[PDB]
From a paper:
Here we demonstrate that [name] is essential for faithful centriole duplication through a direct interaction with the previously uncharacterised N-terminal domain of [name], a key factor involved in the early steps of centriole formation. Subsequently, through its C-terminal PB3, [name] interacts with [name] and phosphorylates it, enabling [name] to recruit SASS6 to the site of procentriole assembly.
Residue numbers in the entry: 13 to 95, 103 to 126, 132 to 357
Write the structure that this text describes.
């Protein structure tokens, strides 16, 4: 009886890769691959404690550009630090962390056990994170590189694998619900929420009082651990199809830092959506009922051939990943 759940429009199915036709695009610059191979080759030769498979990091950025199409732009190599754990040199906010394994070819593939362990790590972060909603937390990307050096060229086989939670969020438009006019609620409905900038998303959580009115809460409020929560609010997107909205829903469903979620995926929870294109927020009832630990995954690979002498160009390599429940890349060129 907290709100009316009668559907006021078509159901929508939300997922990270919905807008991109289930396609994940990876762009990798030749320069960072050249630095990765250069660093790897020195260790394997002029150094003796080199493990046969070197462990490095590539650093990328997550961009969303045409109808919510997600692209990872990988352009930085990072050997990483040892602390006993292997971590990047300096983690920048907005960095996609891609573990890079490479080995000199002599005399490679992703297995489901490797995908499974990556997804366990992914969901453990979703359950335990205390940070703001981040789309980068919704995918785990890895690269295997096999390289060879001869007198003529450097050759590299680059294989990339990803795991993404498969959960679909069912979203139903509902009638508007009264919001207590706190300062946060007033600033979200105010004139400043009308902009046109990319990656200006923010989100929080929705509490409820004795009068069954909604209270908006910042994502950093320490009371979130036990305040009774009924859903989320999202600001700075054009529509509900933005993958950030699904990311906030997933984060709310998975988080074990929120111990008093009296409305969740089984009962349906509320989304107060402040879009950038409308003066008033949209109200949705979101639900999830499928398998919680199911994931999509697949791999893609391509060869690159590099001259010994580097050319000051911006050459890059594009990989297309359309993962599914069965591990098949459903991309056809």
């Amino acid at each position: 009886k907290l709100w009316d759940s009668k559907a006021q429009g078509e159901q929508e199915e939300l997922h990270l890769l919905k807008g991109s036709d289930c396609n994940l695009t990876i762009d990798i610059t030749e320069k960072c691959l050249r630095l990765a191979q250069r660093s790897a080759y020195q260790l394997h030769t002029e150094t003796s404690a080199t493990k046969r498979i070197q462990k490095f990091f590539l650093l990328g950025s997550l961009n969303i550009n045409k109808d919510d199409r997600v692209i990872i732009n990988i352009d930085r190599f990072d050997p990483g630090r040892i602390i006993s754990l292997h971590v990047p040199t300096a983690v920048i906010p907005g960095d996609v962390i891609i573990p890079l394994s490479m080995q000199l070819a002599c005399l490679s593939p992703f297995s489901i056990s490797e995908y499974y362990d990556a997804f366990q790590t992914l969901t453990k972060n979703l359950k335990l994170s205390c940070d703001s909603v981040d789309i980068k937390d919704m995918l785990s990307l890895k690269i295997h590189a096999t390289y060879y050096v001869d007198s003529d060229e450097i050759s590299i086989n680059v294989t990339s694998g990803v795991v993404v939670p498969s959960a679909l969020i069912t979203a139903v438009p509902i009638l508007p619900v009264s919001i207590v006019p706190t300062a946060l609620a007033r600033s979200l409905s105010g004139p400043l929420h009308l902009s046109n900038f990319q990656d200006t998303q923010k989100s929080g959580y929705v509490a409820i009082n004795n009068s069954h009115n909604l209270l908006l809460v910042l994502d950093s409020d320490p009371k979130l651990s036990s305040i009774p929560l009924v859903g989320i609010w999202v600001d700075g997107v054009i529509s509900i199809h933005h993958p950030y909205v699904w990311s906030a829903c997933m984060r709310y469903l998975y988080s074990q830092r929120l111990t008093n979620k009296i409305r969740d995926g089984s009962t349906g929870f509320i989304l107060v959506l402040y879009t950038q294109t409308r003066p008033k927020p949209e109200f949705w009832e979101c639900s999830f009922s499928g398998k919680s630990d199911k994931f999509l995954y697949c791999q893609a690979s391509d060869d690159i051939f590099m001259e010994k002498v580097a050319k000051t160009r911006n050459e890059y390599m594009r990989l297309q990943l359309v993962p599914n429940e069965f591990g098949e890349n459903l991309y056809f060129q």
